[PDB]
Amino acid sequence: GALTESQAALVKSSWEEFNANIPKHTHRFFILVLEIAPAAKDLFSFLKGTSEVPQNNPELQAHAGKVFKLVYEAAIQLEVTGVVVTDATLKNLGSVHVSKGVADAHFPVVKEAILKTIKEVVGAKWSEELNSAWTIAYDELAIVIKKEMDDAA
Numbered sequence: 548g549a550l551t552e553s554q555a556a557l558v559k560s561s562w563e564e565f566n567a568n569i570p571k572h573t574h575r576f577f578i579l580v581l582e583i584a585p586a587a588k589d590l591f592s593f594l595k596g597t598s599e600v601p602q603n604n605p606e607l608q609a610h611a612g613k614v615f616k617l618v619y620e621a622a623i624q625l626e627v628t629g630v631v632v633t634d635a636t637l638k639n640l641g642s643v644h645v646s647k648g649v650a651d652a653h654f655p656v657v658k659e660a661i662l663k664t665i666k667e668v669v670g671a672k673w674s675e676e677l678n679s680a681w682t683i684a685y686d687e688l689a690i691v692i693k694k695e696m697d698d699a700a
């Protein structure tokens with residue numbers, strides 16, 4: 548696919564639709580995560596000691612929303628420029644993931660949870676052309692964070 552002017556216009560459009568409801572899309576996102584792998588729960592300070600995923604936890608919201616923002620920006624940056632660029636932030640991201648005890652085999656958990664989440668968010672507009680475009684953008688961004696973890700470990 549590469550990222551045509553038309554495929555990029557499709558991810559933008561679809562991220563806008565996600566941000567449009569953070570407390571919902573974020574709590575959805577944590578549940579799809581815990582469906583795909585329940586053990587993951589002891590990772591999160593705000594989920595530990597709990598029984599269910601808190602639904603108005605500020606810490607939870609603020610953190611999951613940052614995740615999706617970062618995938619979208621990665622997709623424009625691929626249509627424009629042709630690539631995803633590794634900055635200070637991505638590098639600190641990788642430190643924190645290591646302290647919390649996160650590994651690589653964790654990443655398809657969070658990708659499926661995200662493709663599924665965007666499938667749910669765009670509904671009938673969904674096209675092959677679009678799945679292809681978020682897949683490209685997540686894969687290309689994961690490639691970069693993993694890189695930074697490995698580096699913090």
Ligand code: HEM
Pocket residue numbers: 587590591592593609610613614615617618640643644647649650653654655656657685688689692
């Ligand atoms: C491209 C894919 C990913 C992106 C963009 C991303 C982004 C983030 C960000 C931005 C934060 C910190 C939020 C804050 O400090 O304000 C964070 C924290 C965290 N992330 Fe990820 N993430 C990704 C994949 C993963 C995976 C695969 C896991 C494994 C389950 C994970 C587990 C965690 C944990 C446990 C924390 C600490 C939360 C705490 O104890 O309060 N992340 N991530």
Ligand SMILES: O=Nc1ccccc1
Pocket residue numbers: 607610611614657
């Ligand atoms: O997937 N990484 C996450 C970031 C912040 C909070 C929870 C998860």
